[PDB]
Structure formats: C-alpha cells, structure tokens
Swiss-Prot record, chain A:
Residues modified by glycosylation: 15, 23, 107, 352, 376, 412
Outcome recorded upon mutating residue 102 to H: In strain: B.1.1.318
Effect of residue 260 to A: In strain: Alpha/B.1.1.7
Coiled coil: 227-271
Residues with site note (Cleavage): 121-122
Disulphide-bonded residues: 44-66, 49-55, 310-321, 360-404
Phenotype when changing residue 396 to H: In strain: Alpha/B.1.1.7
Substitution effect: residue 70 to K: In strain: Omicron/BA.1, Omicron/BA.2, Omicron/BA.2.12.1, Omicron/BA.2.75, Omicron/BA.4, Omicron/BA.5, Omicron/BQ.1.1, Omicron/XBB.1.5, Omicron/EG.5.1
Substitution effect: residue 102 to Y: In strain: 19B/501Y, Omicron/BA.1, Omicron/BA.2, Omicron/BA.2.12.1, Omicron/BA.2.75, Omicron/BA.4, Omicron/BA.5, Omicron/BQ.1.1, Omicron/XBB.1.5, Omicron/EG.5.1
Organism: Severe acute respiratory syndrome coronavirus 2
Protein name per the record: Spike protein S2
Shown residues within the full chain: 695 to 1140 of 1273
Consequence recorded when altering residue 370 to K: In strain: Theta/P.3
Encoding gene, per UniProt annotation: S
Swiss-Prot record, chain D:
Residues carrying sugar: 132, 156, 192
Region of the whole protein represented: 943 to 1140 of 1273
Taxonomy, superkingdom: Viruses
Name of protein: Spike protein S2'
Disulfide pairings: 90-101, 140-184
Job description of the protein: Subunit of the fusion protein that is processed upon entry into the host cell. Mediates fusion of the virion and cellular membranes by functioning as a class I viral fusion protein. Contains a viral fusion peptide that is unmasked after S2 cleavage. This cleavage can occur at the cell membrane by host TMPRSS2 or during endocytosis by host CSTL. In either case, this triggers an extensive and irreversible conformational change that leads to fusion of the viral envelope with the cellular cytoplasmic membrane, releasing viral genomic RNA into the host cell cytoplasm.
Coiled coil: 7-51
Name of the gene: S
Outcome after substituting residue 129 to H: In strain: Kappa/B.1.617.1
Length: 418, 85, 50, 198, 37
C-alpha cells in the first residue's frame, strides 16, 4: 500500500476563538541512549601469526602497522571509559534518600534502589539488566555496574530531596510538593493548580511509573538500541574470527601446514599472502570500530547533555526531555547505556472560548499581565494560558497602554477595581 | 582483580580518587605503588523533611575554565613524492 | 650511491668504519667523499607546492 | 596538565606524521627500502616487482594515515561545532542550560584564544552559606489561601516571611507579594498567619 | 619527503582581535551586540 503519515486534523481556526486546557496528564516516557561499547583489544602479532616466529620475522618487514592498530584500539578502549565518566559521574557527592519515604503521596519505589536485592538496583534497572543479553581480549569497564547504579542512585536522591540545587552547588533540601510546584511554575502553570490537585498528580505519576514498568516488561524490542550496539560489536568480532579461516589465495589458511609442507623460499610467499590478507582484515575491523566509536561517543555526549539538562534541571527545550512540557527526569542505569524516565506535563480536555486581545474600559486599553482574556459566552475573565482558571478582570492582573482606537479587535467590558 | 592478576602493588582498604585506571573499579596510585577500589564521591545525606527548606544567605562568583579544540594542523602529503620521490 | 641533492660541508664527525648517514626515513642525509675524506650533508633539492 | 586537550591533538597529529615518515624505512618484503638501490641494482623486469612491493606498502600506509586523519577531522569538527555553540550561547547571551556554561548558575562568559583552541572563562553564581527554615505551601488568612507570586514562605521559628528562592531576603507577607486562590480546606500543609494590607 | 604544513587562514593575532572584539562587545553592550546593534 501507499503509506499514510497520520490522521488528518483540521484545526478549527478563527480570529477570535482560543482553546484552553481544563485538565492535564502526568506522562512518563522512556528514552534509551547507548553510552559505551565492549572494550576489545587485539594482539595484532598473534592474530596474524600466532606463535610462528618466521611469520613474525616476515611481519616485521611491514613496520609499525600492528602498533597503529593497537594504539587505535587502546584509544577506543579509553574513550569508552571517558564516555561513561562524562555521562554518569556528574556529581562528586553521593546522596541518599531519607529512610522515611514521605514525599506527599509520590511513589519512587520502582526507581529507588531495592535493599532486598544484592545488586542494589531499582526494580526498573533490574528489569533493564535482565532484558539485555586468537589474540582477542575483552577489557572490563573501569566503572562496574554496581558503581553506575550507585551514581544513578545518588542522582535520584539529589533530584528528589534537593531539586535542581545540587546540580548548581550545594544540595538545598526542599519538600517534593514544593519542588513540583516550582517545576509547574517553570512551565508557566501557577503553584495553586499543583497544590489543589496534588493527590491526582501523585496518583497519575504513580500510575505512569507502573505503566512504564509494565511496558518495559511487555515489549521485547524496548531495549533495541543497546542490543543493536551489542550485536554489531559481536558480529564484527565474529567476522574478524572467521577471516582467519580464509587462505587469501594461498595453499592453506593454516601457517603450520605451510611451514610443514613447504621449504622457506615458497613458504615465505604463502605466509606473505596470509599476512597481507589478515592485515587487511584487521585494518578493516579497526576502521569500522573507529567509526562506531565516533557514533557511540556522539550518543554519549548527547546522553551527558540530557543528564545535565533534563535530570539536573528543568529544560525549556522542546522535545529534548520527552514529549510535552518537561517537568523532571529520572536516570536509570542500563547495560552499556542509560534510560531516562521523562516526567512531562501534557494538557488535556481543552475547551473553546471566545477571546480578545484587549479590554476597552474608560477609554483605556487593558492587556493581561500574565494570562489571556477568555469568554464563555456572556462574561469575560482572565486565565493562565496552560490551564483554565477563570478570574475576574481587575486592575491587578491587567495593565494599561494607550486608548481603544489602535488595537484591532478590542472589546468593551468592565474592569473591576479592588 | 576482575581485570586480572596484579603483581607489585599493595592492595589497601582505603578509597581514593582514581589516578591510574586498572579496571573493574580498581585503580593504582603512587605514595610505593598501591591499588584500591576507587571512591565515587564523598558521602552526603540530605536532611529531607516535608516542611523544611534550605535558603542560601550568600554567594560565590566562580570563574571556571573550559578548553575546547577548534582546528588541527593542516597537513598535505604529495602522494607521488611520498611513494616514489 | 645515486641521488639528487645539494652537497654542503658537514659538522658531523664520522667514525672510520662509517661511510654514509641515514635519517628517519633511511635516506642518505650525510656522505663521506671517497677521495677527500670529508663529510657532506645532502639536502634534498628545494620542493614547493604550487 | 591544564591544557592537555590541545596538547593531545598536537601530539596525535605529530605522532601520525612521524609514523608516516617512519613507514618509508620499511621494505614491505622487498630487498631494500631505498628506491635508488633497487633501480641501481636490478634490471627493470625484477626491479618492477620490488618497486611494486614498495608502492603497495607505501600506498597502504598513506591510505591508513588519511583514514585516521579523516576520523580525527570528524572529531575535531564535532568539537568545533560544540565550541561555536558555546560561543553563541554562553558569550553572546545568558544560558539557562544547566552545566553548559560552567558549574552553577551561569552569569556570563569570556572567550580567549588558544593555540588551535578556545578557552571559555565561565563566570557563574554559586549559592553559599545556606540556612534551614520552616516552610509552608500556602498561608491561610480570612478563609483564603495565599501563595507567593515569585518567592517562598519561610519561617525562622516564630515569624513568617516570603523570600526569593535563590537568596535569603525576608519580607513581610502582604497582598502585594501573594495571590489568592481558593480556601484553606484543599491545600495540604497550609498554615495560619496574618497577611498585611498596605 | 612530500609532507607540508599549510598555515592557517586566520593568524593568531587576528584570532586574538576577534576575541578582543567579542570581549569588548560583551563588556560594553551585554548580549545586545549578539542580537543586533
Ligand atoms: C470548537 O469549535 C469548533 C467549531 O465549532 C469545533 O470544530 C468542529 O469539531 C467537530 C467535531 O470534531 C467537527 O465535526 C467539525 O468539523 C469542526 N469544525 C471545524 C470548523 O473545524 C471544535 O471541536 C471545538 N472544540 C472543542 C474542544 O470542542
Ligand atoms: C481531570 O482528569 C483526571 C484524570 O487524569 C480526572 O480524575 C478522574 O475522575 C473520574 C471521575 O471523577 C474518576 O472515575 C477517575 O478515577 C479519576 N482518575 C484519577 C486518576 O483520579 C478528573 O476528574 C479530571 N477533572 C476534570 C475537572 O475534568
Ligand atoms: C509504592 O509503590 C509500591 C509498588 O507500586 C507499593 O508496593 C505495593 O504494595 C501493595 C500493597 O501493600 C502490594 O500488594 C504490592 O505487591 C506492592 N508492590 C511491590 C512492587 O512491592 C507501595 O505500597 C507504594 N507505597 C509506598 C508508601 O511505598
Ligand atoms: C459564564 O460564567 C459565568 C460565571 O462563571 C456565569 O455566570 C453565572 O451563571 C450562573 C448560572 O446561571 C448564575 O447562577 C450566576 O449568578 C452567574 N454569575 C454571575 C456573576 O452573573 C455565566 O452564566 C456563564 N455563561 C455561560 C453561557 O455559561
Ligand atoms: C464600545 O464603546 C465605545 C465607547 O463607549 C463605542 O463607541 C461609540 O459608538 C457609537 C456608535 O457607533 C458612537 O455614536 C459613539 O460616538 C462611540 N463613542 C466613542 C467614544 O467612540 C463602541 O461602539 C462600543 N463597541 C461596541 C461593540 O459596542
Ligand atoms: C538543617 O537541619 C538538619 C536537621 O536538624 C541538619 O542536619 C543534621 O546536621 C548535623 C550536623 O552536620 C548532622 O550530625 C545530622 O546527622 C544531620 N541530620 C540529618 C537528618 O541529616 C542540617 O545540618 C541543618 N542545616 C544547616 C545548614 O544547619
Ligand atoms: C558573604 O561572603 C563574603 C565572602 O564571599 C563575606 O565577605 C567577607 O567578610 C569578612 C568579614 O566581614 C571579611 O573578613 C572578608 O574579607 C570578606 N570577604 C570578601 C571576599 O570580601 C561576607 O561577609 C558574607 N556575608 C554574609 C552576610 O555572610
Ligand atoms: C524571626 O525574625 C523576626 C524579624 O527579623 C524577629 O522578630 C524581631 O526580633 C527582634 C529581636 O528579639 C525584636 O527586637 C523585634 O521587635 C522583633 N520584631 C517583631 C516584628 O516582632 C524574630 O525574633 C525572629 N525569630 C527568631 C526565633 O529568631
Ligand atoms: C487555622 O484557622 C482555622 C480558622 O480560624 C482553624 O479552623 C477552625 O478549627 C477549630 C478547631 O480545630 C474549629 O472549631 C473551627 O470550626 C475551624 N474553623 C473553620 C472555619 O473551619 C484551624 O484550626 C487553624 N489551624 C491552626 C493550626 O491553628
Ligand atoms: C474576525 O473575522 C470576522 C469575519 O469573519 C470579522 O467580522 C471580525 O471583525 C474579525 N475580527 C478581528 C479581530 O479581526
Ligand atoms: C686518493 O684517495 C686517497 C684515499 O682514498 C686520499 O688519501 C688521497 O688524498 C687521494 N688523492 C688524490 C690526489 O685525490
Ligand atoms: C509532615 O509530616 C508530619 C509527620 O512527620 C505530619 O504531621 C504533617 O502533617 C506532614 N505535613 C505535610 C504537609 O505533609
């Protein structure tokens, strides 16, 4: 078939009508970002030649190719540890949550570490770790998974107990329904809306966190971004292994068979063919590993940017920290990766209103100080832009600039004076 | 260690910052050569309660450096002259 | 030993078993004249990108 | 080791050049690494073979050098795009992005030229000497709930004030720095205090 | 052996002049010079 791009949505535009949301959804979304790869090291001399001394004597004629390959792989290996250091080690203070989890109805048990588990991981992090499955050596990462989980636990404790203050200096404690109100004011919604509806927001947040855990537990292709990196690295290593079975035009792919079947004048030629074939294979592997290392470094720089801007603060950047108006984010460790739980504000249950740019009163034009003029049909009110909260149009929420003769579409309404 | 066997370094129970990385949380430093589990950071328990806030009473104007490379040395190689002279 | 270059008087002092000198790229950068035993630097003739 | 990032790039480029120069000393399986020795020792039918071995070895070395030079050029281009973004957003403006222009609340920045690089002096504001206060979400007065317009309600133990969030500056809770929304029955943790009217 | 180092198009004093212009703009005018006059 011819593919479709989505549902047609003709927005009901007119010159004096506005749509104001009357409700909201606290939506938590997942973002999975790879951070590091498997640190692989190749003994170039053993890969080309093994233990054959005649092969290494012929390999010394080609110079310092093996040194360049080893140095490139060493640079990739230290770059992976640098990537993990830049992503997760953004705090030098290891914060802990208080033993009493009184956060005004907000539940963080699915993201806080479980004391019953020996790995000290969160249930979400434990599910993430369950869902990820010849001269060659694999160097272990410098930070173990326990310490990466400890770093994410410190970040979670800091962003729960102290707000964004720990990312800019000393951790200044603040109650979580106040932190949330501050985040509400960062996206342009008044504190009262948060305080009046705090039980509903806490219930929505807990329901969204549970839906995140259920969706991760019910989708096999949720962690495909990390699995693609793991599969590419394993497949490149397998191809580098399988290139040893090719003779590259020589009589055999085994150096021992050539050294036992032929005299050194022709065994030198056959070993030279095997050496140049295996060296070309190793150069190809190191080149594609460098390209993939550049890609993983770009992804890790993006992940460090999201760690700084979505977790350690509230970001005004659209769609950088989830879909909707970003409230906060929570980091979770993943095998060779990071998972950001973006908690965002989505407007919902919008309603039509008749709107005007200004109010004409006593020959003066009045403009809203922070909100917008709306009308339900007979009466005029002023409300904040992202939530329907109608208030009487007074001199305290409006300001005066000019007369009524200039502004196009100004309407006549009274302005109350306290 | 999980990275392998380390000979010539005295293992200590104290945790310091990583000087020379060994791997799997092991780092080495010179003070003789010692090997240790690295310290992620200093501990700090935030005094959270549901009705207390911390307000700063002072400030520090802090200037920090950030070094970013921009360009490299522009090198050109005559391929015919390099291969053949 | 054939080549192309500019021959200059050299400050290097060769040992009596030494005849020539090599640089990093194993090109002869210094040579002893076999008739008058003096050392000569061999600078490559001037090359400039156009 | 303050300027290690630029010195790393300089050392990598110089080491790549030194490796490329050093690769001329290798014969790559030929009888000699010097072309003039082969051309003065051998007839062209076998000197062609020896020169062919030297040509393919040196061409492989040069292609390798160009490959890591292009990879390092991509890395340096990414770093330079980052530096241009920092110059646009930290020097030519004040950035709300956390830790993009230094640690702390970013005030301004200064650019300084460096050999093949740029050094940003980020001037930032760090809070210090914090003090505990008892806080409330709202003030209950005359059956109405009062919320701060821009600050936060704090108490030193007996008296309630409103202050800005990033600096302690206590002020009397009035109708000019608070706004009224709803009654006192809904907000959890609302406390009773008077609200002055000028 | 065929290696050449091309000089950069901007010399160090002109790069220093650019940084001096940026410093003078951000000191005397704030962020206004980056958005217009
Ligand atoms: C605001 O009013 C407009 C117009 O009265 C509504 O737009 C109509 O919506 C219905 C139901 O989907 C459609 O069948 C019409 O075709 C729409 N008309 C136009 C001109 O687009 C709109 O739904 C109202 N908004 C809300 C939130 O109810
Ligand atoms: C705003 O939306 C919330 C849901 O996000 C509504 O809460 C639901 O209300 C219905 C009917 O009162 C209940 O059956 C549901 O159980 C409630 N859900 C939750 C999660 O509490 C709320 O009523 C809406 N408010 C307005 C004014 O539309
Ligand atoms: C916070 O959330 C957790 C998990 O969503 C709640 O733990 C559940 O509690 C109910 C009743 O006690 C049990 O039936 C479930 O089996 C529990 N789930 C898990 C995963 O343990 C917990 O009650 C919530 N509240 C607090 C205050 O922690
Ligand atoms: C628009 O809103 C206003 C206020 O919310 C409504 O005015 C009230 O309407 C009810 C219902 O008839 C009356 O009992 C009140 O006395 C009215 N208040 C005032 C101050 O007059 C108004 O009816 C709404 N208009 C529409 C079309 O829904
Ligand atoms: C809003 O009020 C103004 C003034 O109160 C109205 O302007 C008057 O309009 C009538 C009839 O068009 C004229 O005779 C008057 O001379 C006008 N007065 C002024 C001061 O301009 C205006 O018509 C009102 N708008 C609406 C929609 O009723
Ligand atoms: C704010 O009050 C809390 C609790 O009274 C203080 O936290 C205590 O500080 C002492 C001294 O360092 C420690 O011995 C306690 O273990 C801390 N308690 C907790 C629960 O962390 C805190 O120091 C006060 N803040 C300031 C700036 O004085
Ligand atoms: C805020 O901090 C500054 C320092 O950052 C304090 O200034 C110091 O004050 C003491 C005593 O008055 C002097 O001995 C120092 O020389 C001052 N330092 C500087 C850099 O001027 C200031 O007093 C603090 N203010 C408050 C209210 O705590
Ligand atoms: C909290 O702050 C208020 C205002 O700074 C203090 O009230 C003043 O205290 C001084 C010292 O006793 C008196 O001389 C003033 O007359 C008080 N002002 C008023 C309006 O009563 C209050 O004492 C502070 N409380 C604590 C526990 O430090
Ligand atoms: C804050 O003030 C309100 C109103 O003055 C108090 O509410 C009254 O509480 C008493 C006993 O608890 C009741 O008999 C009254 O009927 C309540 N009045 C209303 C209007 O509900 C409230 O108790 C005060 N809170 C504190 C902590 O002092
Ligand atoms: C809006 O459009 C209608 C006609 O569709 C017109 O009568 C009215 O004056 C317009 N209002 C404004 C403010 O442009
Ligand atoms: C001839 O060569 C010898 C050494 O090779 C040198 O000592 C002598 O001076 C030379 N004589 C002339 C006339 O060049
Ligand atoms: C804070 O906790 C105390 C008990 O520790 C409780 O009495 C009080 O009602 C709580 N206040 C709020 C606003 O949750």
């Amino acid at each position: 078939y011819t593919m479709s791009l989505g549902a047609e949505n003709s927005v009901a535009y007119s010159n004096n009508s506005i749509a104001i949301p009357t409700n909201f959804t606290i939506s938590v979304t997942t973002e999975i970002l790879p951070v590091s790869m498997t640190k692989t090291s190749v003994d170039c001399t053993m890969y080309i030649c093994g233990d054959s001394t005649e092969c290494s004597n012929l390999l010394l004629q080609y110079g310092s190719f093996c040194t360049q390959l080893n140095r490139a792989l060493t640079g990739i290996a230290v770059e992976q540890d640098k990537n993990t250091q830049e992503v997760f080690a953004q705090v030098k203070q290891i914060y802990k949550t208080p033993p009493i989890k009184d956060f005004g109805g907000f539940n963080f048990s699915q993201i806080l570490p479980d004391p019953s588990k020996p790995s000290k991981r969160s249930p979400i992090e434990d599910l993430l770790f369950n869902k990820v499955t010849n001269g060659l050596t694999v160097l272990p990462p410098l930070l173990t998974d326990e310490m990466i989980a400890q770093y994410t636990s410190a970040l979670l404790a800091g962003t729960i107990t102290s707000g964004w203050t720990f990312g800019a200096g000393p951790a200044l404690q603040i109650p979580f329904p106040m932190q949330m109100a501050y985040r509400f004011n960062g996206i342009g919604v008044t504190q009262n809306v948060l305080y009046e509806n705090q039980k509903l927001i806490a219930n929505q947040f807990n329901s969204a966190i549970g839906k995140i855990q259920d969706s991760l537990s019910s989708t096999p292709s949720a962690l495909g971004k990390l699995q693609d990196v793991v599969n590419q690295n394993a497949q490149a290593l397998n191809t580098l292994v399988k290139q040893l079975s090719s003779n590259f035009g020589a009589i055999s792919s085994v150096l021992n068979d050539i050294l036992s079947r032929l005299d050194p004048p022709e065994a030198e030629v056959q070993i030279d063919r095997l050496i140049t074939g295996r060296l070309q294979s190793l150069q190809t592997y190191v080149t594609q590993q460098l390209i993939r290392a550049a890609e993983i470094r770009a992804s890790a720089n993006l992940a460090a940017t999201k760690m700084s801007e979505c977790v350690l603060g509230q970001s005004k950047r659209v769609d950088f920290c989830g879909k909707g108006y970003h409230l906060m984010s929570f980091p979770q460790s993943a095998p060779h990766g990071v998972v950001f739980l973006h908690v965002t504000y989505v407007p919902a249950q919008e309603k039509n209103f008749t709107t005007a740019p200004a109010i004409c009163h006593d020959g003066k034009a009045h403009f809203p100080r922070e909100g917008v003029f709306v009308s339900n049909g007979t009466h005029w009110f002023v409300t904040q832009r992202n939530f329907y909260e109608p208030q009487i149009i007074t001199t305290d929420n409006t300001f005066v600039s000019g007369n009524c003769d200039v502004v196009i579409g100004i309407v006549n309404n009274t302005v109350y004076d306290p | 260690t999980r990275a392998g066997c380390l000979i010539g370094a005295e293992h200590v129970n104290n945790s310091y910052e990583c000087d020379i990385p060994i791997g799997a949380g092991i780092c080495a430093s010179y003070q003789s050569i010692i090997a240790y589990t690295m310290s992620l950071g200093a501990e700090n328990s935030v005094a959270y309660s549901n009705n207390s806030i911390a307000i700063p009473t002072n400030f520090t104007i802090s200037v920090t450096t950030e070094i970013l490379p921009v360009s490299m040395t522009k090198t050109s190689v005559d391929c015919t002259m390099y291969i053949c002279g | 030993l054939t080549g192309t270059g500019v021959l200059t008087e050299s400050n290097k002092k060769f040992l009596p078993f030494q005849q020539f000198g090599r640089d990093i790229a194993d090109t002869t950068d210094a040579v002893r004249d076999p008739q008058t035993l003096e050392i000569l630097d061999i600078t490559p003739c001037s090359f400039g990108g156009v």
